[PDB]
Amino acid sequence: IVNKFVKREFAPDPASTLMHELVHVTHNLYGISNRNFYYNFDTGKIETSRQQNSLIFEELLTFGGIDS
Amino acid sequence: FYQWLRSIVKDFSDETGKIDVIDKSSDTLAIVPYIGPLLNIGNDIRHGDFVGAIELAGITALLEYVPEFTIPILVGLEVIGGELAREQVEAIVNNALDKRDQKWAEVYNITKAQWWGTIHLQINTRLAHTYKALSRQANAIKMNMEFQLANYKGNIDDKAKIKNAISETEILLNKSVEQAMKNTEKFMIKLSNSYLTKEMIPKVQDNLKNFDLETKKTLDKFIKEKEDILGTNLSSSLRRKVSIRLNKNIAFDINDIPFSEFDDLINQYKNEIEDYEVLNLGAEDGKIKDLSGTTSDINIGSDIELADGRENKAIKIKGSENSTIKIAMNKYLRFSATDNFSISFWIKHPKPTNLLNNGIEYTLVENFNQRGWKISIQDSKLIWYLRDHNNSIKIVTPDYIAFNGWNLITITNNRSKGSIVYVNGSKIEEKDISSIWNTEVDDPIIFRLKNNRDTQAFTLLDQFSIYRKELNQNEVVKLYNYYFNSNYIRDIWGNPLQYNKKYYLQTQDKPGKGLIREYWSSFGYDYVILSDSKTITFPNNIRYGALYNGSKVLIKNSKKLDGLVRNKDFIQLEIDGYNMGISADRFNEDTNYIGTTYGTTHDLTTDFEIIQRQEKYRNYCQLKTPYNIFHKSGLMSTETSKPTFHDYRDWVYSSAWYFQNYENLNLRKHTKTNWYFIPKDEGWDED
Amino acid sequence: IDSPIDNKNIIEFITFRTDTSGIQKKIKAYQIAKHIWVVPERYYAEPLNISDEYKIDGGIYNENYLTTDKERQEYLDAICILFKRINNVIEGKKLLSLLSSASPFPFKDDTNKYLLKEALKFFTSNIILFGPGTNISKNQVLPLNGDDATSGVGSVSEICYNPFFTKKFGEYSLDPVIGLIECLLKSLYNLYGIKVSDDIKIPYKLQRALNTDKYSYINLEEALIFGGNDYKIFTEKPYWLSNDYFLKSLNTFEENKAKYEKDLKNDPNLNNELNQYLQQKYSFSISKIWSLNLTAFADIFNINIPTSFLASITFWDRSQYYKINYPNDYNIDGFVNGQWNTNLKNIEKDNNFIIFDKPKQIITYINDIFNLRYTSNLYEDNLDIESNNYYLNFMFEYDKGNNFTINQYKALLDTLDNDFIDSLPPIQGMNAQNKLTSLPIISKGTDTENINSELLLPIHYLKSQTYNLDMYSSIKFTTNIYEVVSEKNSELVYTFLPHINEIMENYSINNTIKTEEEFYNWMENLFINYSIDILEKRNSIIPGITAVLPWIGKALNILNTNNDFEEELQLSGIKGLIKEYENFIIPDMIVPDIPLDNMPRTYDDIDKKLSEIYTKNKFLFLKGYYFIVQEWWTTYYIQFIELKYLCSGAINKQQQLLITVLEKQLFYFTNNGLFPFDAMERMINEFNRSIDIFSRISQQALNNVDIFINECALFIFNNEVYPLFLNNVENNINKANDNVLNYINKATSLTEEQIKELTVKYTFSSIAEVEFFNESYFKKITNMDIKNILTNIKNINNLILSGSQINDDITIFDESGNNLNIKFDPSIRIVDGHTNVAFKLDKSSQYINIPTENINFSFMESFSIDFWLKILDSTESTTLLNCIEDDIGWKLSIQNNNLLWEMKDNLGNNFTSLFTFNINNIWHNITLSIDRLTNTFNCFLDGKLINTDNISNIFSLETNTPIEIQSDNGAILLEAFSILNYPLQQQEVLNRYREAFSNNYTRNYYGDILKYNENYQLYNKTSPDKEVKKVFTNDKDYIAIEYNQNTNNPTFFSLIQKEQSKIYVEENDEVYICVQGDPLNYITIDNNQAVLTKDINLATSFKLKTNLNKPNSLIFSENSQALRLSNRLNDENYILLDLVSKLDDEPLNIFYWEFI
């Protein structure tokens, strides 16, 4: 509360960055991953789109939190 | 350069907090209007108006893409065919019904995922755009401030303090920006959730209903055959289950929705009040300590004591100049020029028993070195004082501090706007604090009663807490409810009500009259009657109704629990050793006079019931009477009458009429039903 | 009883004064109560009619009134009704008992009794209640001798009171008892001789006009009677305006009591048993009579009255009177249908009953650019007008003060004998005097004045809102007021609601609405847009204001410029809402000097002399604050209560505009023939029920204005009136500060006492010594001063359905104050449930039957249902609630352990919701709210919103049949079943859910409350399939969860503490865990293990902590360590103490345990 923090920009922990991929490893080891549930971010009609790569639903489930 | 700098902070904080609370029920959008010209959103639908533009189109205006979704054709389900058995074809029917339910839930989840992908992500990028806009507004303000500092022509080599002021001002601007973004997110998330629930599921439900009807047809054809295997009773039960279940709409379960109000409300108090607590001086396990845990260098005098208090033991400053509590100031309690802060504490100030301290203001808690803040107590009035190097504020609470009642005083200091003082959650006065700049001194925060001419004078303190934010009226009243979360019954002072302590009992109406008994030998009944009125004389020569009058009633239980009385507990008042209750026969059909066990001619139903129909913090309680078959349930009240040749008195009666129509009566009649339950407490004494 | 013969109550006496013919005429009277008479004839002294010049604005003046036997009998019955209603309450019959024994002081010279009525021999009469005089609307108490009505002797006044006609002041009818109680209280003053002689007056208002800066002074007697809030502000503990009257009357009372105590009490033979009456008349103190005001009597009768300005606020509009049919429309319990649903008939009739109204200050707006004239009528009370002289030369009294003159007894008229006075026989026989002092019978008033105006006043705006023509004609809304004031269309009406105007911008009575569904949808659409437009509020940056209503500027033409009302209020300030009073008086408050008194006590008694001076100066500065609060009330708060009323009218005018546009729709349907009989009756029935829905949110908008205007009024006092008062105190304290130091100088060489004690103890340090200002006081006087103008119906609980049990019989009643007649069979059992009492609906025949006589279910009416439900036995399909008549209505049931909420309306639209959360024998807080404003059906389970399904296509489901609660298939527990008038929201549902756990009771798995010394089965909340079982296969016995499960044998854990006293396990208490068995061993902690050790002095103490997120779980925490389930090692998750580790601000699921 008394930090006098100018900006709340945090750096990730390498332990948690790897511990994300360990969950994907578990999914692969148990025969769980399916790429059919994906968000296709390619929309041309609005013409103002972030133009991002397709995001797998397994990817958000692995990350967890609000998005999952 | 300080006046302009505080004006900047005040204007930015007040103007980015602008909201418009439209009051459509269950929507109540708190639209911030400045997004209209901040972001070119609602100019197409209604140029120059954004709050009005939201009404015409809740989401269509806010979002750049309404998707107009679609879902596959949803072919109906089927079953297997073979030489089946009854016990397993019944399981087939149950499985088909469960599969239909899971299909409904799955299509709802599919449309929820589509909503999140297409609708919610647009809301998130809108929030990001708003954050960009607000942050660049703040950085433009910072550019102007640092330009102004670059032209400090007035003085030389005095820019360092101005630079620290600008840094703190930028921090304050960032706080205002984050509050504005909290409002923006709060009103956009609700809009998106409403769109999902209202305009998206009903599209799905039509196809889901068609699938459900197809499933019903297939299953009902599956029971016309295999009916002989089932048996007529099992066939009838299965047909009824299929007809009832495969005809309804399965509700969409939104308890797992990403952004929900319940998530934002379950921890409202933790994230808005307790998060900013940097001091909370209380008593735990018989020892005085900082309940927040921020600091531990709090040293207390040898003549400090702990006495019974509002919820747990209370700090009692004996005012003997050795009952000094002092908290060594650390970085948490050091409040700079631009730091808002709030001080909330419970006080119980004894009634002045002798006239030797009037007009002599004596401090209660001071962080003061001829500069700083100071809470003092003059004659029944609490004084809050700020003193800068040249400027000051003195705010005085009206009265009734020295009436021996637990009062929660909370002082909120928004350095930009003003300092407000609330007593018991109700605003007293607000004064401009914009001219006061440095109130920081390194001396410890001192709880002491110095400059007191009375060596026996004391004061009970409880939960003296300091917060690093200015709690507005909503958070102040929320913090005042928090202290009454439990459903305890409060006596007149504000303490919880116990189960083996003798109390004086008086009505809110007719003050000064306590309960006594008289016996009617002709009727053989021991009536409870308000005693003769008496008044007490204050040292300042003002007369007040006496509290220690009549007989002492003893609250009891059917098993002597010896706990604390609660909101709807069943009790047994025992005046002068005789239980109080209403008659249990047809003898007393006139107003149901309340009698005591003295006199065995008539049987009584002793079990009363303390209730608090009004707000939880009131220092009075209603006494609902039991419902026996003879008398209806009523609220213990008093009526003044002369029923027979005996003198004109005030008789206590159950009043079956008040209980039935209680919520329709005005607040003035409710005075008849309230009872105070006066303890004999030090600090209030008529001698 | 119009034709009794004679004797006892029926007499025929000679009138005191002469009839207008010039002679005294015989008349007959009826004794309603002891010494109280009524005579159903028009006043004999006053003429039956007067000229047009003599007529008062708001009279009736018809002469052929109360001139027949039927009318006289109607008046006589109207009286017992009113006097029975007065006698109904205990305080009311105390006032009548006081009046019956309030005979004035008998004349001397053998104790001749005071003025009475001769018979052709004297019948005692404290009052005589005549019929209305020349002015029917005026109920004046005329004392037959004003000279002796003030000196304290007394007077038996004559009252001319008419109870048939009452005003409204809003959307409710004023209670006639208030008009009669006031006439009784005014006559009580005459009987006690305490009259203010018509020359002791107090400012009441700032005069409502354009070119007048004067005040409207009220009589002090009327200010005392019409109490309200304007009486609380000058009757505080320090008395500042207390003048000779409150001392002369009190002094004259003392010797009158004293001269009775020694001369008449000695029982002279000529007194004739008036001693008991006089003993009780003089036992009562006048200080209690002054406390009897007209608003405390309204609160006794539970009447709603405008407490703000009771003597003037009823006159700020056209005088409209409503006839009251007493046998039907007014019984002993007030109005039969309530104060707001009176539905009385207007007095306006062709032949008689002419309401001569001359509006004071007829204001006509004039525009010099456009040919635009707009005349509007202003209406003002009849109080006489004086200048600012009262405040200018108001001299405070240093000595007189807190001496009790006007103290507000919270127990009104409560110190006297009721039955004893009644049991006393009435007076008969002995002679009476007659000195008839002429009353003021002749009077003339000023006429109306026509003064122009250059700006559109709020009265001009309120006139434009009205619809001023017949029913068969179009209505056209507009927002340009200049198109309404120029009456070029005569049907165009101004509206300040842009959303409503846009709806009516494209709306034709011929083709916009063409079917029953569209008419219902359009009616709902108007209600949504009307709610959005008037209930919108915005926060403001002005200190002291929580929120600002933006539509006030467009309604009353205050700060109505091209800028926004919020923006305009910023730069123009709050003072822009008020016409500033330039000649505002701030008291000077001169402090008198100290005398040179001398007594050798101590050191010339300085301490006592200065202590009384210090408290007198403190009181004197308090009267100045009280003088300046009174001045602000009559000068600046009058201009804010005037706004609150002008606002009520504009919202009311906007609301009847939306009703006159819906009634026009149910005239194209009827006349044209568009819809069949059955469909037509629904629209008429639905429109009638919608009127009470519009007035629900119109009152909500006015509640927002009430708070906003109060903040504006207090702000004007805060930094426009108060600071100028403190500056005078600054200059006056320094005088008192200098005066005390000058007097202390004695040259007596006692420098220790003077410097240390005298000069700081009895001396003002600063103005913080005397400020006296608190917003908590101005809120009290200005809160809900004019409340429930539209309706008295609010967000309330119309059903709570509590219960009680005695012996083996039960009762079920409505706890919500509505007193509904709940019907049930007596075989229903009541058992303890979730922090309340729950009804056990076991058999199919058992039922709870709740009537719906006041629970409307129209498509405009939103409602919520809240209850606690537990299914006792495993039932797959049972019913819970049923409110369906002929396949119309709503019902809730259980279907395959899933909730089933289905409901259909009378049009055939069926809505169903099958919640699939699988109720399994656990207490559930199932609260579900149907919000009809947004067409949202929310179902909150355990305080959490789950459904929010829309309910748009479902219309009214109103049914006559009452709500029936019966299981019909199994055993259920129902508790706290509440039906509410308003749709519960997420914030308030969570608060109600939390209050169910406010007892801080620990709960087992099923939701019941945990108990001491009761055996349960323990589960870890993470593996409910495996039960915590004690392990004895090893010497080191412990408790663990086993996975082999070859042999199943449950073990029972019971919470036991050392003292076998408590029965109910609360949160945060020290407990031990007992394991059932022949050894009966307890739980201890050894190396963090949870081994089982016998004996009750080696166990460990656990502090139970419960989290609200998971309410059926417990945490056995010692210090900072809570019980935990270890990792699986040998198919046994042994239990160990571990430091509590959080996840999302709450600990892990392992630390939580459940008892079964």
Numbering used by the authors:
A (entry chain X): 208 to 275
B (entry chain X): 620 to 1306
C (entry chain N): 9 to 128, 139 to 1174
From the paper:
All BoNTs are naturally co-expressed with a protective partner protein (NTNH) with which they form a 300 kDa complex, to resist acidic and proteolytic attack from the digestive tract. We have previously identified a new botulinum neurotoxin serotype, BoNT/X, that has unique and therapeutically attractive properties. We present the cryo-EM structure of the BoNT/X-NTNH/X complex and the crystal structure of the isolated NTNH protein. BoNTs are 150 kDa proteins and consist of three domains: the 50 kDa catalytically active light chain (LC) and the 100 kDa heavy chain that is further divided into the translocation domain (HN) and the receptor-binding domain (HC).
We have determined the cryo-EM structure of the M-PTC/X complex comprising the BoNT/X R360A/Y363F inactive mutant holotoxin and its non-toxic interaction partner NTNH/X at a nominal resolution of 3.1 Å (using the gold-standard FSC criterion of 0.143), obtained from 432,063 particles selected from a total of 5408 recorded movies from two datasets in similar data acquisition settings, described in the “Materials and methods” section. BoNT/X and NTNH/X share a similar fold and their overall domain arrangement and molecular architecture is similar to other toxin serotypes. Similarly to the known M-PTC structures of the A and E serotypes, BoNT/X and NTNH/X form an interlocked complex that buries a large solvent-accessible area of 4778 Å2, which is significantly larger compared to BoNT/A-NTNH/A (3664 Å2) and BoNT/E-NTNH/E (3459 Å2). The main domains that are involved in this interaction are the receptor-binding domain in BoNT/X (HC/X) and the analogous domain in NTNH/X (nHC/X), together with the translocation domain and its analog (HN/X and nHN/X). LC and nLC are situated in both extremities of the complex, facing opposite directions from the interface, and are mostly solvent-exposed. Our cryo-EM map indicates that C423-C467 is the most likely natural disulfide bridge. A cluster of solvent-accessible acidic and basic residues can be found on the interface between HCN/X and nHN/X, namely D998, K1000, K1046, E1048, E1049, K1050, D1051, K1013, and D1018 in BoNT/X; and K636, E787, E789, and E793 in NTNH/X. The location of this pH-sensing cluster corresponds to a similar cluster in BoNT/A-NTNH/A, which has been demonstrated to drive the pH-mediated disassembly of the M-PTC/A13. The charge of these residues will depend on the environmental pH, which was pH 5.5 in the buffer utilized for the cryo-EM experiments. Although there is no particular sequence conservation for that region, BoNT/X in the M-PTC structure also presents a flexible linker followed by a small helical conformation leading to HC (residues 876–895). The BoNT/X-NTNH/X complex structure also provides structural information on the receptor-binding domain of BoNT/X, which revealed an unusual array of surface-accessible hydrophobic patches despite presenting the same overall fold as other BoNTs.
